[PDB]
Amino acid sequence: VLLQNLCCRILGRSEADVAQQFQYAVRVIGSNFAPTVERDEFLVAEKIKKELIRQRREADAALFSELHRKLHSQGVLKNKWSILYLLLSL
């Protein structure tokens, strides 16, 4: 049911309208549910710094290091690797 909210956020429609896309989203997400690579937040971190340095934005590469620690400080996030692996891709 949560995948259908996403198709209504990106595409502005109601669930009775957009059902061909949601048919394509179940095809990809399903059968590809399990994570395929070993999970570690260290490697994904050293790739968001390496990327913001490559854009001559060396100041935000040291600000992320202060925002990635706060995530551990609060502790309401179980899988921190996944949400960063995704934010980096987009």
Partner: protein, 121 residues
Amino acid sequence: SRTFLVDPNLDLSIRELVHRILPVAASYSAVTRFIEEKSSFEYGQVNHALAAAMRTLVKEHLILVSQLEQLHRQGLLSLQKLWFYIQPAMRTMDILASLATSVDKGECLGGSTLSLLHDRQ
């Protein structure tokens, strides 16, 4: 050309596999010494940019060792699992450890270092 020593009293089921991992280290201790030497000016404007572009790969080889230690803390890294992880590194650090030993054998600088990269995944 580095030689290593393992152990007098160790399991034979390990030493035969240890000697299968080391050829990526000995092939590495001859690349990092090629960078720190062929960077001297008295070697031309080619043996320099060859040592720079040969350094970015060393950086990516240091990241591949970092991601292994962080994966070693959770104990998910068995010795048998190691021999498979470094395979992309055993092929690359085997190419560069062959150029860095064939550019210094016959002293090359300038064009004769750009020919060797045209005769030599």
